[PDB]
């Protein structure tokens, strides 16, 4: 049978070919995930088939109907077999599904308008006249809700009254508004993302400081798929063998619009 | 009517390490260290009693390729002489084959190891020249990462290393970072950046850790196939990195008990 992955579009993970509509099927899309959708499928041996998430999210449970969404849904409820994209391996999802050992590994980290005078989370919360900020939902804003470490409670008690409201409903809108707001906003967000960003045309942004944590993303299968072993084994094969390093750096700086 | 479930670590600081006094001490008493504190928060976790025991043979776990036997915690775990291994034992292919691993517990690299004042700040300084020799283990997945990179600047180190004379190989950790402070700035050791970092905060503080992270890894608990602690295992890991709980736990062992200010 084809395997059904199901994956997500996003920069550089999966994206539509300039000439997708003369193409069809996986030679639709190009990208850091659909490179290793092919790694993998070679050292798993089967055929598959790309379909992009139909509702555009990566995988949360409605806390009212206790329903699965986007692509960790379309694994428990049995409509794809396997997901490849940027999805984080977190203690709720792993309950639900299988994932692969990481294939990326990454942590929150601070993007800046290039001049602010900021070059750490500790700069970050000992000031006032940057405003700083996370997603208004999500596993990066609860990390500083939840945090008992001193800088990122200082953090959290600042970003928690900032007025006016120092959360973004997306990730785009915490790139847009620090690069629209003259120096006086920083996006805390996903350091993959930030590294990516900061490769990219107008190329008027830095990734600063340490990450603050460290979590990784998995390739994820329904639990007890049969699937799951060999994947595993490709996401380790393909580590040691430098392949992902590689697909990193191709789609995140060999293909930098910011020069060498 | 119920069985205690049967740890197997090594010694390797500041993972697990003899306390002080531990001859004044009993059973799990003896030992301290990150993992020693990461055993009882998986055991808490998982609700399980346990036993923590070194280690027979000293080592982590390799197949020989002439017997076929696995030594070290690997070689306990499969043919049954413990139940967990927990200890900075890296997810590996040929391991994850045989037993089961959680979740990383920790992630690191390659990284560059120098005695303070030797004019080297990257791969890319050591690659580009000779006056300063530099080398790794003589075994294992460090050296093998230098000898099969199509990386151009791994390429012309391990094009150096494999030929320089004397050797700049070592037999172990500790004869690397030996080497690296009795060498006269004249020796840069490449190493787990967990080990560098953690020595770096040592008397008598004279190494430093240079340059980003050549990779990427992982340190893994690990449990036999169809283990029924397996999967918990698994989900405390999560647990504890989502808590923070090891990001505090190396904090501790690296920092507030570090020595170099
Ligand atoms: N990758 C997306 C967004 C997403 C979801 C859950 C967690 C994180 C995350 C990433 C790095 C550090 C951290 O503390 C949290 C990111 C997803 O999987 O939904
Ligand atoms: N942790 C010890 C030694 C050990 C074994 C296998 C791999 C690595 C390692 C660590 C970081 C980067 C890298 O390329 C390799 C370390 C063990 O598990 O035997
Ligand atoms: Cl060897």
Redesign the interface.
């Given at each position: 049978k084809t395997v059904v992955v199901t994956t997500i579009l996003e920069s550089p993970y999966v994206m539509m070919k300039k000439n997708h509509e003369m193409l069809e099927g996986n030679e639709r899309y190009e990208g850091y995930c659909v490179d290793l959708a092919a790694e993998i499928a070679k050292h798993c041996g089967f055929k598959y088939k790309l379909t992009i998430v139909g509702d555009g999210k990566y995988g949360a449970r409605d806390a009212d109907t206790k329903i699965w969404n986007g692509m960790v849904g379309e694994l428990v409820y049995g409509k794809a077999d396997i997901a490849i994209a940027p999805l984080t391996?977190?203690?709720v999802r792993?309950?639900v599904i299988d994932?692969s050992?990481?294939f990326m590994?990454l942590g929150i980290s601070i993007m800046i308008k290039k001049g602010t005078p900021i070059e750490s989370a500790e700069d970050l919360s000992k000031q006032t006249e940057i405003a700083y900020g996370t997603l208004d939902s999500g596993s990066t804003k609860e990390f500083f809700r939840?945090?008992?470490?001193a800088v990122f409670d200082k953090m959290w008690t600042y970003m928690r009254s900032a007025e006016p409201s120092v959360f973004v409903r997306t990730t785009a809108e915490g790139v847009a508004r620090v690069r629209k707001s003259k120096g006086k906003y920083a996006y805390l967000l996903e350091s993959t993302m930030n590294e990516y960003i900061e490769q990219r045309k107008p190329c008027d942004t830095m990734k600063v400081g340490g990450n603050l944590?460290?979590?990784?993303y998995?390739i994820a299968t329904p639990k007890g798929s049969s699937l799951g072993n060999a994947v595993?084994?490709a996401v380790?094969?393909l580590?040691?063998?430098?392949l992902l390093?590689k697909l990193k750096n191709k789609w995140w700086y060999d293909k930098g619009e910011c020069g060498s």
């Open positions: 391996i977190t203690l792993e309950e994932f050992k990481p590994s939840r945090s008992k470490i944590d460290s979590k990784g998995g595993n084994l380790l094969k580590n040691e063998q430098g390093d």
